[PDB]
Design an enzyme around this catalytic site. Sequence first.
Site, PDB file in Angstrom:
ATOM      1  N   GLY A 126       0.844  -1.439  -0.080  1.00 32.59           N
ATOM      2  CA  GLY A 126       0.089   0.185  -0.002  1.00 32.59           C
ATOM      3  C   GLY A 126       0.775   1.491   0.103  1.00 32.59           C
ATOM      4  O   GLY A 126       1.888   1.271  -0.328  1.00 32.59           O
ATOM      5  N   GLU A 127       0.031   2.726  -0.103  1.00 33.27           N
ATOM      6  CA  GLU A 127       0.735   3.455   0.386  1.00 33.27           C
ATOM      7  C   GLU A 127       0.420   4.374   1.835  1.00 33.27           C
ATOM      8  O   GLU A 127       0.127   3.179   2.836  1.00 33.27           O
ATOM      9  CB  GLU A 127      -0.069   4.738   0.375  1.00 33.27           C
ATOM     10  CG  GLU A 127      -0.635   4.739  -1.464  1.00 33.27           C
ATOM     11  CD  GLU A 127       0.752   5.040  -3.090  1.00 33.27           C
ATOM     12  OE1 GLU A 127       1.888   4.768  -2.556  1.00 33.27           O
ATOM     13  OE2 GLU A 127       0.805   5.640  -3.204  1.00 33.27           O
ATOM     14  N   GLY A 128       2.154   4.172   2.383  1.00 28.53           N
ATOM     15  CA  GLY A 128       2.412   5.144   3.681  1.00 28.53           C
ATOM     16  C   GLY A 128       1.472   6.988   3.199  1.00 28.53           C
ATOM     17  O   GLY A 128       1.213   7.015   2.586  1.00 28.53           O
ATOM     18  N   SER A 129       1.920   7.468   4.399  1.00 27.68           N
ATOM     19  CA  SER A 129       1.950   8.182   4.632  1.00 27.68           C
ATOM     20  C   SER A 129       2.416   9.253   3.533  1.00 27.68           C
ATOM     21  O   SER A 129       1.659  10.292   2.762  1.00 27.68           O
ATOM     22  CB  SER A 129       1.406   9.065   5.838  1.00 27.68           C
ATOM     23  OG  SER A 129       3.294   9.187   6.253  1.00 27.68           O
ATOM     24  N   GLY A 170       4.827   7.509   0.359  1.00 20.91           N
ATOM     25  CA  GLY A 170       5.917   6.853   0.361  1.00 20.91           C
ATOM     26  C   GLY A 170       4.860   5.505   0.055  1.00 20.91           C
ATOM     27  O   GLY A 170       4.439   4.836   1.095  1.00 20.91           O
ATOM     28  N   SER A 171       5.143   4.578  -0.547  1.00 17.96           N
ATOM     29  CA  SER A 171       4.518   3.305  -1.471  1.00 17.96           C
ATOM     30  C   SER A 171       5.566   2.250  -1.181  1.00 17.96           C
ATOM     31  O   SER A 171       6.703   2.119  -0.665  1.00 17.96           O
ATOM     32  CB  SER A 171       4.485   3.523  -2.830  1.00 17.96           C
ATOM     33  OG  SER A 171       3.831   3.898  -3.497  1.00 17.96           O
ATOM     34  N   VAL A 172       4.480   1.375  -0.365  1.00 11.30           N
ATOM     35  CA  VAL A 172       5.407   0.109   0.600  1.00 11.30           C
ATOM     36  C   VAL A 172       5.287  -1.030   0.076  1.00 11.30           C
ATOM     37  O   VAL A 172       4.078  -1.765  -0.623  1.00 11.30           O
ATOM     38  CB  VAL A 172       4.820  -0.150   2.071  1.00 11.30           C
ATOM     39  CG1 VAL A 172       5.816  -0.851   2.287  1.00 11.30           C
ATOM     40  CG2 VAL A 172       4.920   1.053   2.481  1.00 11.30           C
ATOM     41  N   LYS A 216       9.827   0.905   1.804  1.00 14.37           N
ATOM     42  CA  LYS A 216       9.161   1.881   1.828  1.00 14.37           C
ATOM     43  C   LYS A 216       9.956   2.944   0.567  1.00 14.37           C
ATOM     44  O   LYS A 216      11.512   2.832   1.392  1.00 14.37           O
ATOM     45  CB  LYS A 216       8.750   2.656   2.829  1.00 14.37           C
ATOM     46  N   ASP A 258       0.386   9.956  14.010  1.00 15.49           N
ATOM     47  CA  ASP A 258      -0.726   9.687  12.975  1.00 15.49           C
ATOM     48  C   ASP A 258      -1.001   8.224  13.183  1.00 15.49           C
ATOM     49  O   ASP A 258      -0.748   7.400  12.607  1.00 15.49           O
ATOM     50  CB  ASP A 258       0.590   9.550  11.537  1.00 15.49           C
ATOM     51  CG  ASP A 258      -0.373   9.359  10.259  1.00 15.49           C
ATOM     52  OD1 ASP A 258      -1.690  10.526   9.801  1.00 15.49           O
ATOM     53  OD2 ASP A 258       0.391   8.975   9.496  1.00 15.49           O
ATOM     54  N   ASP A 281      16.106  17.911  25.970  1.00 14.63           N
ATOM     55  CA  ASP A 281      15.961  19.036  27.008  1.00 14.63           C
ATOM     56  C   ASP A 281      15.665  20.288  27.044  1.00 14.63           C
ATOM     57  O   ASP A 281      14.536  20.709  27.749  1.00 14.63           O
ATOM     58  CB  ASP A 281      17.473  18.884  27.256  1.00 14.63           C
ATOM     59  CG  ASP A 281      18.039  17.392  28.117  1.00 14.63           C
ATOM     60  OD1 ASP A 281      16.925  16.682  28.509  1.00 14.63           O
ATOM     61  OD2 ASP A 281      18.933  17.497  29.023  1.00 14.63           O
TER      62      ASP A 281
HETATM   63 CL1  LIG Z   1       5.611   3.040   6.161  1.00 14.43          CL
HETATM   64  C1  LIG Z   1       4.403   1.695   6.375  1.00 14.43           C
HETATM   65  C2  LIG Z   1       2.968   2.636   7.137  1.00 14.43           C
HETATM   66  C3  LIG Z   1       2.296   1.449   7.235  1.00 14.43           C
HETATM   67  C4  LIG Z   1       2.633  -0.173   6.586  1.00 14.43           C
HETATM   68  C5  LIG Z   1       3.887  -0.362   6.783  1.00 14.43           C
HETATM   69  C6  LIG Z   1       4.445  -1.967   6.413  1.00 14.43           C
HETATM   70  C7  LIG Z   1       5.756  -2.106   6.713  1.00 14.43           C
HETATM   71  N1  LIG Z   1       5.214  -3.925   7.227  1.00 14.43           N
HETATM   72  C8  LIG Z   1       3.964  -4.102   6.691  1.00 14.43           C
HETATM   73  N2  LIG Z   1       3.913  -5.433   5.827  1.00 14.43           N
HETATM   74  C9  LIG Z   1       2.354  -5.635   5.654  1.00 14.43           C
HETATM   75  N3  LIG Z   1       1.690  -4.299   5.633  1.00 14.43           N
HETATM   76  C10 LIG Z   1       1.898  -3.843   5.288  1.00 14.43           C
HETATM   77  N4  LIG Z   1       0.712  -2.410   5.137  1.00 14.43           N
HETATM   78  C11 LIG Z   1      -0.116  -1.830   5.205  1.00 14.43           C
HETATM   79  C12 LIG Z   1      -0.431  -1.050   4.906  1.00 14.43           C
HETATM   80  O1  LIG Z   1      -0.555  -0.337   4.241  1.00 14.43           O
HETATM   81  C13 LIG Z   1       1.002  -0.370   3.349  1.00 14.43           C
HETATM   82  C14 LIG Z   1       2.106  -1.258   4.481  1.00 14.43           C
HETATM   83  C15 LIG Z   1       3.399  -3.484   5.905  1.00 14.43           C
HETATM   84  C16 LIG Z   1       4.942   0.995   6.409  1.00 14.43           C
END
Ligand SMILES: Clc1cccc(-c2c[nH]c3ncnc(N4CCOCC4)c23)c1
Lengths: 291, 276
Positions: B9-12, B14-16, B31, B118, B145
């Site tokens: 999927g997408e993060g906030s 970047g694509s993962v 990511k 987030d 600090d």
């Molecule tokens: Cl930066 C970020 C933000 C949310 C999830 C991940 C992620 C890491 N390891 C993962 N394994 C499985 N699914 C993952 N999805 C959840 C669905 O959206 C894409 C990332 C991830 C990374």
Amino acid sequence: DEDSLTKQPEEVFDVLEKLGEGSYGSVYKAIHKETGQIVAIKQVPVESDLQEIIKEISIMQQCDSPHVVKYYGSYFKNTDLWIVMEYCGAGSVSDIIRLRNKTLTEDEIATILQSTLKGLEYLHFMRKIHRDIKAGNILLNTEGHAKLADFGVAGQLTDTMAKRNTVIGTPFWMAPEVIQEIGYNCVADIWSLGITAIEMAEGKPPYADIHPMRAIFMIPTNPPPTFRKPELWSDNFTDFVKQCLVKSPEQRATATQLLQHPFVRSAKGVSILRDLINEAMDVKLKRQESQ
Amino acid sequence: VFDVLEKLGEGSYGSVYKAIHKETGQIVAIKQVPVEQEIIKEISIMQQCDSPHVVKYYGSYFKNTDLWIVMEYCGAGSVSDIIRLRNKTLTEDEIATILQSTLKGLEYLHFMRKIHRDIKAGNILLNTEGHAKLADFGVAGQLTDTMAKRNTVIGTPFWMAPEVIQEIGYNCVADIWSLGITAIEMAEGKPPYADIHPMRAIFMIPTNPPPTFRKPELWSDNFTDFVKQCLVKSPEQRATATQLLQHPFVRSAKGVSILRDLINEAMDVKLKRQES
Ligand SMILES: Clc1cccc(-c2c[nH]c3ncnc(N4CCOCC4)c23)c1
Ligand SMILES: Clc1cccc(-c2c[nH]c3ncnc(N4CCOCC4)c23)c1
Ligand SMILES: O=S(=O)(O)C[C@H](O)CNC1CCCCC1
């Protein structure tokens, strides 16, 4: 006789595929069973801000322009509001870039932005701010005619209100003066048009990979964005974008003035969109043959 | 370097993608983010963290202009995905167990002077065993600090704490407000104000009374009180992760075993959709 007057909406319209999301709900293709006419219907639940939906409908009703999606009428379906609109058979420019996995040629952008600017010139004369100008909200009909869509977040100027101050839009596309607390007017849409020109050329706005809420804080302070690779593009296209993305809203060009910019003034008819349209709708029809 | 598979999927920001470490056969998430300094922040915060309740950092490579960050893989994906895939909201008991693990993550982060900023169902992951882990440190903040507060307006609007939205500074308990909204999100399928525009909601959250369940009669007094304790407007009064771990709704939470069916169904519907 008396049985034709209480026909329910799902009896009047044949509802087909989801086309995408709108302001406060989803939008579907549909056929008026009686006339065979094709339409788009936004379905809005009752728990939406119905004030804002009436505003959208109202702004659409007041507008009479071949460059703005027409309103056809409304139906209630249980508690759901059905808003019935002009159908544009090529979809959004956003969809057409996605479907083909290709950005647009200078020629295709020129022609689309000319029609888009005629829409903006009409809106701005009618004291309307769109506030959500992007590729997502510019539609093409099968003939290649562009129309502004999605008046969900649109603003009205009046005798007593020469400016709005509502912070609203889609961050990447939003003008600095919209983001700052100071009031703004129609030329906010011109900044958004600038970003959209970049979006059609490159496939995404500037800061597209950054967080939206980090971008909103940077746009006011940052210099005007430009192309990721300036050497790829004509001087006319580069200058068009530069004229759109002037930070001072007082100095920024109007839709009327930009219609005279060499990049746009020189624009070819919709006939150069023939291939773009045909390829897009072909990829659509192929993907729909997975039923 | 490593075998890149499907987009997860997408993060906030970047694509993962799923991936296999060519050498070890180990499975990982990567990511990909292009570069225009702030990204190093996410990587930095990831390295400083060592917790079974937080996705661990493995390392970084740059590929062309794009930076690829290598992370712990959680095979069930996000709670957001699992609700969508099954077209079902979660039971009090499934929420309880997931949020207990989530709170242990927050308790670790907050002790380490880190704000996530987030917190939502999108950013809570389950591994195949049903262990929950905090993901997506893209917008995370660090206290020091000389900086006992941040003032950066950042997050996902519906989930964002009033004090984050107001110009006044804030600290860790912003995450607890977000947890409250997330509790409602998992229960009802969407946050409050979901059918409003984001940018209209952001201006209302500070002024509005604390959101509540759409149908109060559906939910236990324990769950109703949990959400009420999370969604206290005064950040000074709001409960900490440690305090909420003792809340009857959460303290009484069952083992990961009640997630077995939820996990299995989800990943099954995933595998079926990947065969089309
Ligand atoms: Cl930066 C970020 C933000 C949310 C999830 C991940 C992620 C890491 N390891 C993962 N394994 C499985 N699914 C993952 N999805 C959840 C669905 O959206 C894409 C990332 C991830 C990374
Ligand atoms: Cl309120 C609203 C907002 C955006 C677009 C439309 C729309 C009207 N007539 C259309 N024909 C085709 N496709 C349309 N869209 C729907 C939204 O997603 C993109 C395609 C439309 C409506
Ligand atoms: O185009 S359709 O929506 O199918 C037909 C309309 O529902 C007709 N509605 C009118 C209401 C007032 C009295 C006369 C009929």
